[PDB]
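Reviewers asked in the last cycle whether our approach scales beyond single polypeptides. To address this, we selected a multi-component target totalling 487 residues and predicted its structure end to end. The input consisted of the following lines:
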Amino acid sequence: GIPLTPLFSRYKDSYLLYSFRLIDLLRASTHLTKLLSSQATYLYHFACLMKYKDIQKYEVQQLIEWAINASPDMDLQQFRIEFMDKTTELNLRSCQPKSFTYTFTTIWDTMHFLSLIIDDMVYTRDKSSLDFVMQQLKTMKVLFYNVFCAMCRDHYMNVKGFIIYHIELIEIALDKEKYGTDITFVDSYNMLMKNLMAYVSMTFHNHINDYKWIQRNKKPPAHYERMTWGEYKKLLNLQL
Amino acid sequence: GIPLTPLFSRYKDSYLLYSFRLIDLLRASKSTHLTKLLSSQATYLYHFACLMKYKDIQKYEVQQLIEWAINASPDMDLQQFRIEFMDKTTELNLRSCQPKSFTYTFTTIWDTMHFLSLIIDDMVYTRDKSSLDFVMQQLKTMKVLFYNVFFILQCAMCRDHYMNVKGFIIYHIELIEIALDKEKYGTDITFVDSYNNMLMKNLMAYVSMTFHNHINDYKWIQRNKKPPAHYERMTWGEYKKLLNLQL
Ligand SMILES: Cc1cc2nc3c(=O)[nH]c(=O)nc-3n(C[C@H](O)[C@H](O)[C@H](O)COP(=O)(O)OP(=O)(O)OC[C@H]3O[C@@H](n4cnc5c(N)ncnc54)[C@H](O)[C@@H]3O)c2cc1C
Ligand SMILES: Cc1cc2nc3c(=O)[nH]c(=O)nc-3n(C[C@H](O)[C@H](O)[C@H](O)COP(=O)(O)OP(=O)(O)OC[C@H]3O[C@@H](n4cnc5c(N)ncnc54)[C@H](O)[C@@H]3O)c2cc1C
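The resulting structure, written as structure tokens, was:
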């Protein structure tokens, strides 16, 4: 369970937009097609699981085949219109983003969103199904690895391991639990920080913004605020 | 400077061995993509070897060694390459770059990584404020070496795994770039011993040690094997002692 805050609601919507922009690439692509659809399937299974308490395996598959077979000459506006029709026919309208304005915030929101999910999924885990969670975590690493502005892509390629590293810390903690050592949640960075991925993605996010001034060799603007853990836990109303 | 210790000694030789086994790969490069990726990697490796061995990068003597390697017979074996290597390094007055031992293992790779970490910490800590641009270029070179690690030995699992979490290391080098950039524009670095413009002294040594334990903690989840009760894990307390790291 994750509090339903205004920021979280934007996160939920950005996720849908991200997913839309992802499946739109299927036409443009092999190995990549397999990787893309595999990622789009997970993203959409989880969206349906959240909206319908069911992954809707058949409807989601129908969505992916369509996107994979959509006209590669079709532009984004047309792909959207057809996407709105297809999801409608499939009774997957709740998987449609409310907004289609795609920006860096869409990607950031998506990355923070996944972090919140990882935290919650891990915390509300069921010792009976630790294997399930770990499989979910493996998929999460893949989602983060493939998030890759040519400049941004190069930088991300170089430091995305910071995030993936922490997901592995989680895998380790979980593997210890399945073998006798329950986890001990603490709220500071077999112990694990609660809201770990939320803190790591916030930190990663600030770092990326700190570094860009170095890439651009141009000093920060006047009103250049920085996100603090204390203020972030508030916007998402995180539990300590 | 980096304190002389039995562990740092092994590090220096391993680094030269790793550097040697890497250039040995040029003569065998099948494509241009790899050739220049190997030559760049090999160039930076030797640059830093010459820095710790001659206090100078030896930019031009090294470009000759690389030139040679790249154009060495892809027919002879490692034993023969070693022979031609020793003579060329001699001819270019770079004998200090010849390895004492040729036993190549994962330890050789870890030692090389921990060596660079120690190098990063020293060059930053003993930096000259008027040539920060120089130190930052060195760090950029360091990120390239950590991004492009060649295992040379066989272990797909390792390659894929390092490909996934190497950013944890590079991320920290960028934190150092940020610290230096700040010093460049007015705020001097303030060193502390724990993990404004504060920066942990011996940061990369701490970062590399931690990354190393992590990798070793994770291989059990990878091989679904049970860790032996004797599993020894490196502590920062112990590591500092082994390298005579200064606080
Ligand atoms: C994966 C990725 C890599 C990037 N790499 C680069 C790069 O190499 N070079 C470059 O110039 N730009 C890069 N960017 C873009 C850059 O990070 C900013 O998104 C963009 O410059 C807009 O800046 P902003 O300050 O207006 O917005 P942002 O600060 O990005 O706004 C993001 C949103 O989240 C909030 N937020 C701000 N900081 C945090 C935080 N630390 N934690 C959580 N939420 C936060 C804001 O309130 C806002 O709603 C990257 C973007 C992504 C998604
Ligand atoms: C970058 C990299 C990635 C790897 N990825 C994998 C992988 O995915 N899966 C896998 O099974 N193996 C992987 N390995 C190999 C693995 O880490 C070990 O090298 C190997 O399993 C042998 O372990 P060992 O028990 O001999 O100890 P090693 O860890 O190899 O010991 C080497 C030396 O380092 C010292 N040392 C030990 N821990 C530390 C530390 N934390 N800090 C500093 N020195 C330390 C030891 O005292 C010893 O002298 C990787 C190796 C490298 C270099």
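Residues 1-240 of chain A form one domain. We regard this as preliminary and will revisit it once experimental data from Aim 1 are available.
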